[PDB]
Paper text:
Intriguingly, the autophagy adapter p62/[name]/[name] was recently reported to recognize N-degrons, the N-end rule substrates of the well-characterized UPS, and where ultimately these substrates are delivered to ALS8,9. p62 is a key selective autophagy adapter that plays a role in the degradation of various cellular constituents such as misfolded proteins and their aggregates, malfunctioning organelles, and invading pathogens. Intriguingly, it was recently reported that the central ZZ-domain in p62 plays a critical role in the recognition of N-terminal arginylated BiP/[name] by the Arg-tRNA transferase ATE1. Here, we present the high resolution structures of the ZZ-domain of p62 in complex with 8 different N-degrons including type-1 and type-2, and subsequently identify key determinants involved in the unusual recognition.
However, an understanding of the manner by which the ZZ-domain binds to type-2 substrates is problematic since there is no deep hydrophobic pocket in the ZZ-domain, which is known to be involved in the recognition mode for type-2 N-degrons. Therefore, we determined the structure of the ZZ-domain in complex with a variety of N-degrons comprising three type-1 N-degrons and five type-2 N-degrons. As described for the R-BiP complex, two aspartic acid residues, Asp129 and Asp149, bind to the α-amino group, and Asp147 forms a hydrogen bond with the first peptide bond, which means that these interactions are conserved in all different N-terminal residues. However, the side chain of the N-terminal residue of the N-degron is recognized differently. Furthermore, the hydrophobic side chain of Ile127 guides the orientation of the side chain of the primary residue. Therefore, relatively small and branched hydrophobic residues at the primary position might provide very weak (or no) interactions with the binding patch of the ZZ-domain.
Residue numbers in the entry: -3 to 47
The structure:
Amino acid sequence: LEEEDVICDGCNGPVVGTRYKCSVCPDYDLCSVCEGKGLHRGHTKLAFPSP
Ligand SMILES: [Zn+2]
Ligand SMILES: [Zn+2]
C-alpha cells in the first residue's frame, strides 16, 4: 500500500517518535537527532508525536 512517511530534511533519515515541523519553511521536518544537534534553530518549529 501507499504510505506517507516523514523524512528528515537534515539527515534524510526517518522521522519517528517526535517530529519537529517548521512553522515557516514549507514541508520541512527534523528528527529528534537533527533537532538535538540544533539544526534549523532560527525558525519556530512544531513538536508533536510522529506515529
Ligand atoms: Zn535527522
Ligand atoms: Zn524554517
